[PDB]
């Protein structure tokens, strides 16, 4: 039933806010929190993400976290900013200076208890909490360090609930500081241990999509975050609308994750919008499987698919959908592991997103994701072999040993992906 949403830091809070705008529009909820839709299908499972307050008001089940105030002031002034509950804003003053150790061990620790109090108050009033989703980046200090601290405390107090993240992975092509590879390696180590599902969103890929396909000479953060919000809408559609299926986050996890550590998913979206030509089912199918629509900069022909979910939205022929999904599997069979039968699953929702007649969202558990971690590992090593920029971290109390251990964990994850790719 109920999901609790958490957004931490600058990146996390910008994409989180965009997510709430898009889905609030789909459910017919305006910025004041009043329902003005045309169809009972919009409200029948509204309670998954929204609480009902007095006056038939709908309030997002959302907690907003940062170590500095700036971005949460921008949220509060943003177009839908009044819809969030005021008591759910939890912010410090110091900042974390793009420093994972400040987020995880010093500045963040002072705030974490007050954040957990609000989480507990939201969970306490849930009829039947299914679990949690977190939005954050891995390259900074607050979302990365404090986000993974939060993940650890939530597991300790709610050990049998599902913990899911949408995680933005750094790239030198879109970079704020040189230390991003350190912060990302430290964070992945935590995710391998403490999440059930992590959507890998690579700023490299989002940039290449804006540049090559959508034709934009200077992509802003706003342009990248538009794709992210559309993808997240796609991926939560099956819980959010009456589509026959009787599912919860745990049944989805059981269907998608064959080994506990290999739970990092590659998202995609079709069609890519910045037009009027409607799109045939063959075209949706061909484009959703195309490398160029993937949100993690990995070649799926360089690995094999452990599992795939496809979600189609809009009015279309289910016969034709089945035929096209079968066509792609039968003609490209070598990229799908033979030892998990029937590992491609398909959903259809009648309600299309805003501004499109037909769309498709892709979720892949592919061994080609090892390419992303290798990237990060090389950037890590190039600095760590000379200890460059380490004094920022040891000054907050960390030893070199912790860096060596994190590096080892991530090289092991890569080796595991390779083991299942050669089988």
């Amino acid at each position: 039933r109920e999901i609790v949403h958490i957004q931490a830091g600058q990146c996390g809070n910008q994409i989180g806010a965009k997510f709430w705008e898009v889905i609030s529009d789909e459910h017919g909820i305006d910025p004041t929190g009043s329902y003005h839709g045309d169809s009972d299908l919009q409200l029948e499972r509204i309670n998954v993400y929204y609480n009902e307050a007095a006056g038939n008001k709908y309030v997002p089940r959302a907690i907003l976290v940062d170590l500095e105030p700036g971005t949460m002031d921008s949220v509060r002034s943003g177009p839908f900013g009044q819809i969030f509950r005021p008591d759910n804003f939890v912010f410090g003053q110091s900042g974390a200076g793009n420093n994972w150790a400040k987020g995880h061990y010093t500045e963040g620790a002072e705030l974490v208890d007050s954040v957990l109090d609000v989480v507990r108050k939201e969970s306490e009033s849930c009829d039947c909490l299914q679990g949690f989703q977190l939005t954050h980046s891995l390259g900074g200090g607050t979302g990365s360090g404090m986000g993974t601290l939060l993940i650890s405390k939530i597991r300790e107090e709610y050990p049998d609930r599902i913990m899911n993240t949408f995680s933005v992975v750094p790239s030198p092509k879109v970079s704020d500081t040189v230390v991003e590879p350190y912060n990302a390696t430290l964070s992945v180590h935590q995710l391998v241990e403490n999440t059930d599902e992590t959507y890998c969103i690579d700023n490299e890929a989002l940039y290449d999509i804006c540049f090559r396909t959508l034709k934009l000479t200077t992509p802003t953060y706003g342009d990248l975050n538009h794709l992210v919000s559309a993808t997240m809408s796609g991926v939560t559609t099956c819980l959010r609308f009456p589509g026959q299926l009787n599912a919860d986050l745990r049944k989805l996890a059981v269907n998608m994750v064959p080994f506990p550590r290999l739970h990092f998913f590659m998202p995609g979206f079709a069609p890519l919008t910045s037009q009027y030509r409607a799109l045939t089912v063959p075209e949706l199918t061909q484009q959703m499987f195309d490398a160029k629509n993937m949100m993690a900069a990995c070649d799926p022909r360089h690995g094999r698919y452990l599992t795939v979910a496809a979600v189609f939205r809009g009015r279309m022929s289910m016969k034709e959908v089945d035929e096209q999904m079968l066509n792609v599997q039968n003609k490209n069979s070598s990229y799908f592991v033979e030892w998990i039968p029937n590992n491609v699953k398909t959903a259809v929702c009648d309600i299309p997103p805003r501004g499109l007649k037909m769309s498709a969202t892709f979720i892949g558990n592919s061994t080609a994701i090892q390419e992303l971690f290798k990237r990060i590992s090389e950037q890590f090593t190039a600095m760590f072999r000379r200890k460059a920029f380490l004094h920022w971290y040891t000054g907050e109390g960390m030893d070199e040993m912790e860096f060596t251990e994190a590096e080892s964990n991530m090289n092991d994850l890569v080796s595991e992906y390779q083991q299942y790719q050669d089988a």
């Binding site: 650890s152 597991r155 300790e156 050990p159």
Partner: protein, 53 residues
């Protein structure tokens, strides 16, 4: 092909046509369920010990 044992009622009839001749007790169930629950307790305690470290 011998037709034998015809029976008849107001709602139908039946017959046969021949073409050719030729547990654990409650205690054990309870024990098994409790052993599984104990294994779950053990795994949960190992997790929480990791987190205290």
């Amino acid at each position: 092909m011998e037709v034998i044992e015809l029976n008849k009622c107001t709602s139908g009839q039946s017959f046969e046509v021949i073409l050719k001749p030729p547990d654990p007790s409650l205690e054990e169930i309870q024990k098994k369920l409790e052993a599984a629950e104990e294994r779950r307790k053990y795994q949960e305690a190992e997790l929480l010990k990791q987190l205290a470290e």
